[PDB]
Every structure is written in C-alpha cells, then in structure tokens.
Design a protein around this ligand. Sequence first.
Ligand SMILES: CSC[C@H]1O[C@@H](n2cnc3c(N)ncnc32)[C@H](O)[C@@H]1O
Ligand SMILES: CSC[C@H]1O[C@@H](n2cnc3c(N)ncnc32)[C@H](O)[C@@H]1O
Lengths: 281, 281
Amino acid sequence: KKWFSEFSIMWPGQAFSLKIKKILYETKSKYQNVLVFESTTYGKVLVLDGVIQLTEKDEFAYHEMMTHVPMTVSKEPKNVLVVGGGDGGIIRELCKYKSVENIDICEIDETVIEVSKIYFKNISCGYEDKRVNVFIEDASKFLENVTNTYDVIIVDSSDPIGPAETLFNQNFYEKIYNALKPNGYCVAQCESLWIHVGTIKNMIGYAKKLFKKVEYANISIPTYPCGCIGILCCSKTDTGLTKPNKKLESKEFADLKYYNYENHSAAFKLPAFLLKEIENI
Amino acid sequence: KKWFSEFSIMWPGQAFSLKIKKILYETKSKYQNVLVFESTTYGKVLVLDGVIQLTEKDEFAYHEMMTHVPMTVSKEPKNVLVVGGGDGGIIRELCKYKSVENIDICEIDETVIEVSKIYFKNISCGYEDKRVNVFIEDASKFLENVTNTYDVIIVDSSDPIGPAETLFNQNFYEKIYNALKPNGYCVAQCESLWIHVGTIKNMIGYAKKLFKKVEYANISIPTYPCGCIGILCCSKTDTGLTKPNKKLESKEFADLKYYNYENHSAAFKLPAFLLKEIENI
Ligand SMILES: CSC[C@H]1O[C@@H](n2cnc3c(N)ncnc32)[C@H](O)[C@@H]1O
Ligand SMILES: CSC[C@H]1O[C@@H](n2cnc3c(N)ncnc32)[C@H](O)[C@@H]1O
C-alpha cells in the first residue's frame, strides 16, 4: 500500500502521513487540486492543494468547536454565515439548532461541495436542510455585496496558500465586522500555536483593530499539522466567547463527540509561551 | 537532505516525519536502539526504538506538565522519584523547587543518561544537582526493593514496546502505591486519547484498583503521535490532582513556557468521547 504525505512550506521540516487504502477521486478544479482517498485508519480523507482538510475519524473535533463555541454564546442566533466550509461539517453542526432560521454558506469552489455530497455523505448531510443557502463566490466579494447582517459568522477556510489568500488580511475583517449584527460573533480558523505565532499575532492584530474582544482558542485534532488548530474568536462586546450561555441538552446534541460545556472554556487556556507573545498586540 | 519517520504498530496507518539536518549519534545499547539527530526545524531529537522521545522545540510542554501538575498539588514534597526519564527533563523541572530534598531517578538504560548529558545539555543540566541520585535499574525491580517512600512519583517511561514493557501492568501500580507516602501522588505517561482508548481504559482500571482518585489529563505536544499525550494521575485522597495548591511565582519558574495555574486544571477537561469511554471503569 502507498502513503499520502502532507508537506508544505507553511510547516517546513515536518510532515504527517496516512497510509492509503484506495484513492477515490482526484481533479484540478477552477481553484485547487482535489484529492479524496480512503485511509487505512482514519477513514476517508479530503485533501486540497496537498493539505488535509478533514478525515472521518477526527473532523468532529474541529467542526464541533468551531460551531458550538459561538453558537452557545450567541443567545438566539437566527441567521448564520459559513465562509468556505464546502464539506458541510459546520452546516451539519449548525442544523442541530432548531432556532436557526437561515444558514448561508459562501464557498468559492463548488467542486468541494459536490465532492463532499458524493464521498462524505455523513458530513455533507446538512445540505439537505431547507434553511441552507449556497453561494458559489469568493467570500471576499460576497461580504462586500451582502445586504443581510449575521448573528454568527464562521470562517471555515483552507490555508492562506490558495483561494483563501483573500481571507487573511485587514480588509477582510472590516467586511466581517460590517456584515455582523452589532452584538455579532465571528470565529475563524487560525494557525497552529506550535508553528506560526507570527501569523496568529497578525490575525489578532487585524481583529483587534475593529473588535472589542479578540480571543484565541485551541482544538486538539491529530490530522492538522502539529496536532492542533486555533480559533480566532471575535466579539463586539467586551464579554467575549470563552463562556457559554447555554447547555446542549436536547436530543439533537446527544451525539456530540468532542464539545461539552467545560471544554468550551478550557480551549481558551493557552500555553504560557503563547500568552506571552500576544500580550502587547 | 533526508527525513526521519516515526512508523509503529502502536499507531498503524499514520506516521510523523522530521527533516534531518544531521545524524549526531546512533547505537544499540543493552536495551534499545538510540538515535540522536539534529532536525531542520525542531532542533535536536532523541529517538529510542524508532520512537521520538523528545525534541528541543517542544519537550518543555511535556516535562512541565508531568512535573508541575503533581508538584503544585503536593504541599511540601521532599522526596521525589522519577521512573525512566533518562534525558533529565523531569529532573530539570523538579530542581526548580528549593524545598525538594532528594530526587531519585531509576532509569534502566545508562546510555540514555550519558547521551543526554552529551547531546542535550540544556535538558540534562539537572544531573549536576546534588539532590539527584541515579539508579540504573529496571523500575519494576527498584520499586520492589526501595525502602524509602515518596511524596511524588513521576513515571516518565518510553512506550510499552521495549524495556517499559514491565511498567504497564497491575503489579506495577501495586509497587507505585506501596512506594508512596499515604498522601502521595503518582503521574504516569499514558497513551494518546486519539489512538488507543483501550490502553487508557486498562491503565485507569489498574490505577483505580488501589488509588482513591484516578484522573487523566492531556498535553499538547506536536512530536508525539496524534499531537498529544495523556497523564495518568493517581491520588490516595479523593481530592485528586486537577487543582493546584500553589502558584509558581519565584524567579526559578520565571522561564516556564507551557505550564501555568489555569492550564493545570484545563488539561483535565477531556473530549466528550473520552469521558464516555472511561465512565463505567
Ligand atoms: C474544505 S472547507 C474549506 C473551504 O474554504 C474554501 N475557500 C478558500 N478560499 C475561499 C474564499 N475566498 N471564499 C470562499 N471559500 C473559500 C475552499 O474552497 C474550501 O472548500
Ligand atoms: C527517554 S525518557 C524514557 C526512559 O524510560 C526508560 N525506561 C524504559 N523502561 C524502563 C524500566 N523498566 N525502568 C526504568 N526505566 C525505563 C527508557 O530507557 C527511557 O530512557
């Protein structure tokens, strides 16, 4: 059997590999190279431009924290935007909230969406929900054009190399801020604390120039570089996102595999070296 | 340049790799294969039987949590035992406590100790401390023979394949229990929550058969499989190890890079799937 390996200039000198049971699909779409394969131990794996986006074994860790962190802090969220997130993992978690009225998803690459519908049916199942509306568009342009404002915005992007190039700048957080309700929250995928604090520093800096409260949380997920990924958390009130306003006790949240009330707040308890680096921002 | 790769039957179907700047030393000792190399991005790396034991970039995460968790809960610890731990990382952290009177280390493989003294001088520096006493012995036999009892025992072992074979059974936790003071604490390296809950379940089961309070904490560390490792925490009182009794505010702890008062307790906030698996043990 062969092995897939995740090399990148974004994490030089290290690489994570998964044994391949079989390659399921590959293509060059309008924007990126798409790879789907079945791994021997992590289930099916989605890859974009050589970077692991998810695996069936551990995606829940990432999708549950990215979603249920802002959604338990927002009191009655009605309209939620997902930026990127073509696989539908965030949507899957968003749909569990009966009180949500609309879920917009702006994903640049329709291939990702259709690939997920075909090969990742237990992840993309939320596309069947009547509240979900899909826009195939660069979120950079979508956010300039959108007339609605949102309670929660979840930025579930790929990395800064590729189409997500436009989602990691000062201009982009303006657009996020303006597209939010005056008491609105945004969470974004942010680097690993273990590999580039510089990037994390830059993001927090862009966010703090508009947002009253900017926090950073960490998620354990084995198939992202360094075994973890951060959540750039953005609030318009000084109350922030570290503390949930509700508990997910209805039958829809019975299946949660990572998120709970306690680990919500825990995710915000960062290694000493990290706290130190971000303090004078 | 070449790459070092960590393959194992203990985590099949996955592998982590580091680019090699240069190989520094290799040998077959009485017990295991030893590899020291300089990596391109993680500094010097120690490998035993093909398994990464530490790297200069991230070892602090592991050594600080393994040490300062029990040492901030034990009120006036005087005599501490390190099982395994030949690199001296735990000793380095133990030495920061002025109140410690004795530090015994039982390490089976003297080669590891001397290799660390030569190639990892900023990790093994605590061997120069007059309180540190070294026993080259299987901790399985050492614990049967020792006449002293300890306030804290830190089990800083390699994995169950190799000489640490004898440190992962019911008999071994008897010995730990008996070698502890009646209000004594033991922490042990335990699996990754992401790869074998079975092992974790087995360890907690052995510990609970003797110890009043058995807890499990998780540490973020990129160069262990799945990017994390657990601490099997064992207490003789129902109070446990989740809550520190002191704050590390003296100039000796000024250099801490991971541990702090808040993330002590945070480490014990586990993913939902894990809590579920261990509940009826
Ligand atoms: C797999 S989930 C991450 C998604 O982010 C999408 N993405 C990257 N850049 C942008 C952008 N500028 N606008 C919308 N979606 C994007 C990628 O196509 C990917 O499907
Ligand atoms: C590198 S720190 C981990 C150490 O645990 C040591 N070790 C493994 N098994 C045993 C044992 N039975 N007794 C003492 N030390 C051990 C290994 O030699 C290694 O140096």
